[PDB]
Amino acid sequence: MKRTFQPNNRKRSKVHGFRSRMSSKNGRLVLARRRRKGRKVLSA
Amino acid sequence: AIKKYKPTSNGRRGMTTSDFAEITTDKPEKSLLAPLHKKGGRNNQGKLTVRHQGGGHKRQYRVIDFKRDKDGIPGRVATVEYDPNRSANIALINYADGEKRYILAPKGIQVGTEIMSGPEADIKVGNALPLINIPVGTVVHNIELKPGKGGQLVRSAGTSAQVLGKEGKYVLVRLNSGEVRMILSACRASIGQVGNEQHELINIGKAGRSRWKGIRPTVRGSVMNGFKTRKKKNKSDKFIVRRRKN
Amino acid sequence: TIQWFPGHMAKARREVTEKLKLIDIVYELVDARIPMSSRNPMIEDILKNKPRIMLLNKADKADAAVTQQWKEHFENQGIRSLSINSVNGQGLNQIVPASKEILQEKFDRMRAKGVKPRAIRALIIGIPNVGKSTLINRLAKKNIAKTGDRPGITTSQQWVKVGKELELLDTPGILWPKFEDELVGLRLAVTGAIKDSIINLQDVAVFGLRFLEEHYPERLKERYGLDEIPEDIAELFDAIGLINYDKTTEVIIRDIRTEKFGRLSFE
């Protein structure tokens, strides 16, 4: 049976990428929160 | 006219098809073509607004000419072709000037006929004239509403209207649906009744033919566990002489 | 011989007895082809102190003269009788007035007692494979009961409210637990009303052939594309063809119930 995760590099960058986050306001808020916590990796 | 298939299968019982006895070509003209993609009843937001739509064979738009306005320059009908977008057939005209156009095909058009549109054109099938010039009693189609646009009314398959009166600065016309109303006298109209008059006797005969034509299944509201809607202060009510009470 | 008597037949008697009080009038369906043998003494013993009318359904398949004579015999016997065709309403219009005339005594007594007249409650009873459900469907015009071309279709009694005028009670067919006279059993099996997988079809076919030879020699002569009256059965059986040695018995019984022959009666 097909499991729910079928990896693909293009869609991952198009949806959870840095520029997609920076395009809208809520993505910028997400980036700000992740910077505040101090996570080593942010966006995707 | 109408062809009946023999019952060689369960899905062919009672299926009837057209005859295509008024087609002289099978290839359109590259000049008068344009792309046309399919929408699924969605809109600019992507949400569904109209149900029972979507799918079907691909089509290409043919640029019809509903405005005419090519006065003088007599034209000769070159061919009559089938159009998938509308319910009628179209005709290609090679104007003597040189430019070719597409028009709706009225019933009775033979290849080689000479047509002409303008205030001095005579009364015969295929011509186009302002409503002032045409006399009482004629049958016309491709009615215009305001001068400068193109053929709003009565241009489907086998539909016709009639001229009744010539009251000043207007014309009394009766439409296909028993309506009687006045139209601005400077508007244009084409003589004759639209062809392909037997289009309404065709039996689809199968569930998949409507799928080909682009119609999706309809679910009754019961298992989904006479009020007039015309506006009551709508304009153009002063022009409606006799209502559509049928 | 013939013994068919399942348990739902036994339960039907008890249910009818337990719901006897509500009944106003009784309709007793009786086949026209065999009017005397189709009566059920077992259910008649339970049924007493109640007015009733004899109905002769499937009257199109029987000879008119013998049915009318039997109608006279029932009438002068001391009971009302009628001839009806269920599939097409022939005598269905003249039963409501008869019921009204019969029950008028109690109706006027109740009316003078000071209450509004109410609906007539009728109970339909008879042997299986007779029109006790088709008649109800015709009377109600609704097609509400289940009908079939084999005995034992319905299994439980049911109330049907025909307008504000009638309340009908239906009932599965009932047969007496043990037969006594073999001729009656043979006639019943010929007419149907039995599962036909419990009995011997060869004896039924023999009885049919001998009755035909005795009564309708001309109809036996015409038969189906053959003209002879020999002493045995094997002459007619091998008309149209290893061929079925005696399975043709079914054929003999197949057409007769469908009236491939003309109308007849066994009386």
Next chain:
Amino acid sequence: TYNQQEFVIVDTAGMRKKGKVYETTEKYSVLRALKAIDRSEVVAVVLDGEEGIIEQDKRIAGYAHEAGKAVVIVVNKWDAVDKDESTMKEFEENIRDHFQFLDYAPILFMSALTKKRIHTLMPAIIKASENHSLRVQTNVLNDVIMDAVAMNPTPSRLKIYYATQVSVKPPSFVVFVNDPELMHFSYERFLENRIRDAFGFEGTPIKIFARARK
């Protein structure tokens, strides 16, 4: 006096919605109008024929019904709307669809302006006068009860033991049961229909009381 019979008639100045009656104590008259119902025993509700059924009309008819009084639904002003065939049934059927809670009330049509069929109002009134004050025999009433429960043996199981009448107006009845908790409003309404069909009992409400095994 009408047909050698005396009568008393009272007007009530109309009634409007409770929410929008925020007047300057001029609505104090509505209390007077409500008082007349208590002293009256036959109620005539009047609806306009030119206008359709308004939601407030159903509410007003509620007060009369909850007071246990005979009701005769009346419509006026037919001179406005068309008088024709099947225009009788258009409002006759529509009233039944909307005014379900009262079905016993007879329906009368008359226009006061043109005085059409005005004299027919009293024939309705006198008939309604008797039914609001009527008693049925104890023997007969009981005999009808178990006929209804026999054909509908779906009351553990609720048991019916006795039935009789208490009041003349309106006709109250009490049934002795093993427990009144088993009584269902659907079944209680069922008993009323059978009683209303056994006899006339036209144009008057009926109330049924239930008593325990005692």
Next chain:
RNA sequence: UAGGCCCAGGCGACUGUUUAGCAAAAACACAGGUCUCUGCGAAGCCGUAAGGCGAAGUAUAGGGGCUGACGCCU
């Protein structure tokens, strides 16, 4: 490695679609029939609005209900 066959009754005309993971059916859809609204910035819908679908289509054409092949009764 390759079709078991023959009779009699219901139900649904047929091919198809459904409760991923208990119910594949008589349930849904379907071709045909019928009622109702709509004269064009149409009627209906999505959006607070701008802006769109219907359609670049015009009453033999589009929305919304009820039934459900085709032969004999309504």
Next chain:
RNA sequence: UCUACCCAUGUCCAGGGUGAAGUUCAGGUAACACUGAAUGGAGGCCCGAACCCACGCACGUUGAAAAGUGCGGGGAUGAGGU
């Protein structure tokens, strides 16, 4: 990125059957519609592999597997699968 529906562009379906329209000869005729003969290759047509489903039975149920396996079964040029 699983599943529901839609949009634009690609791609897949071993073999074998039945024989519609049309066309030609032609009893028939004055010629038909109807005989037959030849040609023709239509179908939400038939049998059946790849592919897609999931009707029956058995096993497994701290399983090889948090929906599988084995033997039978349905569709298989279309309202198809991807």
